[PDB]
Enzyme design. Structure first.
Site, short mmCIF file in Angstrom:
data_model
loop_
_atom_site.label_atom_id
_atom_site.label_comp_id
_atom_site.label_asym_id
_atom_site.label_seq_id
_atom_site.Cartn_x
_atom_site.Cartn_y
_atom_site.Cartn_z
N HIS A 171 61.54 -4.72 -32.97
CA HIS A 171 62.12 -3.84 -33.72
C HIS A 171 63.83 -3.64 -34.26
O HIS A 171 64.59 -3.69 -34.69
CB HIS A 171 61.50 -2.69 -34.70
CG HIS A 171 60.53 -1.91 -33.17
ND1 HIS A 171 61.80 -1.18 -33.01
CD2 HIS A 171 59.74 -2.34 -32.90
CE1 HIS A 171 60.57 -0.98 -31.88
NE2 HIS A 171 59.10 -1.32 -31.87
N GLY A 209 67.40 5.60 -28.92
CA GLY A 209 67.67 4.59 -28.32
C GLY A 209 66.89 4.42 -27.50
O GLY A 209 66.86 3.48 -26.10
N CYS A 246 63.55 3.26 -27.20
CA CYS A 246 63.01 1.76 -27.48
C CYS A 246 63.14 0.73 -26.53
O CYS A 246 64.43 0.92 -25.98
CB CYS A 246 63.19 1.41 -28.84
SG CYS A 246 62.11 2.94 -29.96
C1 LIG Z 1 63.03 3.83 -30.56
O1 LIG Z 1 64.17 4.07 -29.73
C2 LIG Z 1 63.34 2.61 -31.69
N1 LIG Z 1 64.89 3.31 -32.35
C3 LIG Z 1 64.90 2.02 -33.19
C4 LIG Z 1 66.07 1.88 -34.96
C5 LIG Z 1 66.13 1.10 -34.71
CL1 LIG Z 1 67.69 1.08 -36.30
C6 LIG Z 1 65.56 -0.06 -35.02
C7 LIG Z 1 64.63 -0.08 -34.38
C8 LIG Z 1 64.51 0.92 -33.42
S1 LIG Z 1 63.10 0.97 -31.95
C9 LIG Z 1 63.17 4.54 -31.02
C10 LIG Z 1 61.90 5.71 -30.15
C11 LIG Z 1 61.72 7.15 -30.62
C12 LIG Z 1 63.39 7.90 -31.60
C13 LIG Z 1 62.65 9.46 -32.04
N2 LIG Z 1 61.66 9.54 -30.59
C14 LIG Z 1 61.40 8.20 -29.90
O2 LIG Z 1 60.24 8.02 -29.53
N3 LIG Z 1 61.84 4.17 -31.95
C15 LIG Z 1 61.93 4.56 -33.52
O3 LIG Z 1 62.13 5.24 -33.82
C16 LIG Z 1 60.29 4.11 -34.19
C17 LIG Z 1 60.64 2.72 -35.09
C18 LIG Z 1 60.61 2.83 -35.83
C19 LIG Z 1 60.59 3.80 -36.24
N4 LIG Z 1 60.05 4.74 -35.05
C20 LIG Z 1 59.43 6.15 -35.10
O4 LIG Z 1 59.36 6.38 -33.77
C21 LIG Z 1 58.91 6.99 -36.19
N5 LIG Z 1 57.89 7.59 -36.06
C22 LIG Z 1 57.15 7.32 -37.03
O5 LIG Z 1 57.33 6.26 -37.98
C23 LIG Z 1 55.60 7.98 -36.56
F1 LIG Z 1 54.72 6.50 -37.26
F2 LIG Z 1 55.22 7.37 -35.11
F3 LIG Z 1 55.17 8.28 -36.24
C24 LIG Z 1 60.28 8.38 -35.88
C25 LIG Z 1 59.44 9.20 -37.33
C26 LIG Z 1 61.17 8.06 -36.35
C27 LIG Z 1 60.35 8.92 -34.89
C28 LIG Z 1 59.19 2.06 -35.85
C29 LIG Z 1 58.14 2.33 -35.72
C30 LIG Z 1 59.67 0.51 -35.67
#
Ligand SMILES: *[C@@](O)(c1nc2cc(Cl)ccc2s1)[C@H](C[C@@H]1CCNC1=O)NC(=O)[C@@H]1[C@@H]2[C@H](CN1C(=O)[C@@H](NC(=O)C(F)(F)F)C(C)(C)C)C2(C)C
Ligand SMILES: *[C@@](O)(c1nc2cc(Cl)ccc2s1)[C@H](C[C@@H]1CCNC1=O)NC(=O)[C@@H]1[C@@H]2[C@H](CN1C(=O)[C@@H](NC(=O)C(F)(F)F)C(C)(C)C)C2(C)C
Lengths: 306, 306
Positions: free
Chosen positions: B41, B143, B145
């Site tokens: 992603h 950030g 991920c």
């Molecule tokens: C990452 O660090 C990622 N951030 C981004 C930002 C962009 Cl523009 C693109 C791709 C990624 S990967 C975060 C880590 C999270 C943020 C808060 N704490 C963490 O651990 N991952 C995410 O933001 C992932 C990402 C999209 C949504 N997401 C989430 O974690 C969602 N959760 C959900 O929708 C749920 F189903 F798990 F509950 C939340 C609501 C933003 C926390 C995807 C799953 C691809």
């Protein structure tokens, strides 16, 4: 979200750990530039330790008696001197992995990471607080002496602790990197006990802010208190006095959450007076005091290191 | 003595972390030899994430669109492919700090260290368990991920987790290093909840052995039980079944302490039925389930890594 007891990344320190052997005694040392720092009792056998005369033992040693190993490789010792309870071995090779570093003496209530090592090799990393009674609640076995504690700020490693000994009740004592003990302890196998410990109030408040930031808010009450009245209550439950300096240090967390420090003090007072009634805060059934305000901010804001 | 939640030394993994940027999206990657592994992603904006078609988004990218940075230095991407929920970027430089490593899929109940990273730089390290419901109780922000989880055995890093997302109640979900999620989760911003969690019984027993080894022995009772009767009680308190394989894995700790596993089960049953009555075990007011038998032995025997 989430809140964990988080240690600093250990790699900068891992690159500095070595093994020092003198006679049959081996412990860990810290190699920075062309100096190896280790506990002076590397020069003792398990008989000299009841009442050692370090100055006397050392004068009978020469450079070649210290076997320093960095991984495989032996570093040749070309000088030695004692500073308080540490030995400094000058070696003929500068450690090419030496980070930017400082030696600092920390204050009770401050936290740091420990890299527990045996035979010059790291076993694990965990976070510790310097307790008000100048002990740490560590996890250390035979052979762990010379393991270090440290903080990292961007690229700079502040070394604050070298491990020397274990006291009754399974708590630990050691020195700064100039070999001066934290607390009243001495490097000898003799009857020593820690003073009664106290709870680090400012850290408890920090952790309550951490709970609010994570959405754990059940304990917030609708009241405020004065610093004075708060300190009279804290005193009874063996909490350290909260000072104005402590209040000032909590200012960032207070501003972020919009909860005045003395309002959080009122909530803490009620927890102390009434207990948690079987509920948890951040997964914990006891109030936690080993997170500083800075630890909370670092963890909740994602501060990184080089 | 002492017992702490201890993470593996992180240095071997720190040397593999990089930043991957695609468009305006930046997350962390893992550089081993000439490949960078990161969540797929990275190719999404904060609009594509509601229901992304990754295959479609990727075909519109080419190598040069992926900006990979290791510290200062940009690594030139010379190929790319998607494997499940991870992207693999072939780069023209092999990482000279690559450790000996393996990719492993861990089982629920097993523990690992997380190196939480932002913008390719490490923030901290902590220990986590893969929960029975395939989440971890982490500490992760925007950030984070592409941060990884790992075990170390001597010189060999077994990577078992890459971070992707946060679920309700502030728990975390991610993939193995082949991009297959732990649990039923998908990499999309859609309504997802973890199943009800369970307590990892074998780890609780491990930790009770750790307590005995540290001299915390108040909870040992004079009884034994059968595995069957133990499992009927555990079941009511939402503990996982204890299997014969679990019993066999506890054999080292049982032999060291001279307490049969089913005798420790009888003690656990009484704690479950009567509570701790305001007492602590190893400083904890709740029974802890995030130490494996191996973690206990590693910590109590001083196992080190290269
Ligand atoms: C990452 O660090 C990622 N951030 C981004 C930002 C962009 Cl523009 C693109 C791709 C990624 S990967 C975060 C880590 C999270 C943020 C808060 N704490 C963490 O651990 N991952 C995410 O933001 C992932 C990402 C999209 C949504 N997401 C989430 O974690 C969602 N959760 C959900 O929708 C749920 F189903 F798990 F509950 C939340 C609501 C933003 C926390 C995807 C799953 C691809
Ligand atoms: C070190 O790793 C050291 N071990 C040795 C062994 C020899 Cl032959 C010489 C020098 C050293 S330094 C350990 C770490 C301990 C062991 C158990 N857990 C730990 O943290 N340090 C010691 O063994 C130190 C060492 C002599 C005694 N000692 C102790 O820790 C004592 N403690 C005390 O006497 C007391 F006052 F703190 F309580 C115990 C009883 C062996 C634990 C000296 C203090 C120089």
């Amino acid at each position: 979200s989430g809140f964990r007891k988080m240690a600093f990344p250990s790699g900068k320190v891992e690159g500095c750990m070595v093994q020092v052997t003198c006679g049959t005694t081996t412990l860990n040392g810290l190699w920075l530039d062309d100096v190896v720092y280790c506990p002076r009792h590397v020069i003792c056998t398990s008989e000299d330790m009841l009442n050692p005369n370090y100055e006397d033992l050392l004068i009978r040693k020469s450079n070649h008696n210290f076997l320093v190993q960095a991984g495989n490789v032996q570093l040749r010792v070309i000088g030695h001197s004692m500073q308080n309870c540490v030995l400094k071995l000058k070696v003929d090779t500068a450690n090419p992995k030496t980070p930017k570093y400082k030696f600092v003496r920390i204050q009770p209530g401050q936290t740091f990471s420990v890299l527990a090592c045996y035979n010059g090799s790291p076993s694990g990393v965990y976070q510790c607080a310097m307790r008000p009674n100048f002990t740490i609640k560590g996890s250390f076995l035979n052979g762990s002496c010379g393991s270090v504690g440290f903080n990292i700020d961007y690229d700079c490693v502040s070394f604050c602790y070298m491990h020397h000994m274990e006291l009754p009740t399974g708590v630990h004592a050691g020195t700064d990197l100039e070999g001066n003990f934290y607390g009243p302890f001495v490097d000898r196998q003799t009857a020593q006990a820690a003073g009664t410990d106290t709870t680090i109030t400012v850290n408890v408040l920090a952790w309550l802010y951490a709970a609010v930031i994570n959405g754990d808010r059940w304990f917030l009450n609708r009241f405020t208190t004065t610093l004075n009245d708060f300190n009279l209550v804290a005193m009874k439950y063996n909490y350290e006095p909260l000072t104005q300096d402590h209040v000032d240090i909590l200012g960032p967390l207070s501003a972020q959450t919009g909860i005045a420090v003395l309002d959080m003090c009122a909530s803490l007072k009620e927890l102390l007076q009434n207990g948690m009634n079987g509920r948890t805060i951040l997964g914990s059934a006891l109030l936690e005091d080993e997170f500083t305000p800075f630890d909370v901010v670092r963890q909740c804001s994602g501060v990184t290191f080089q």
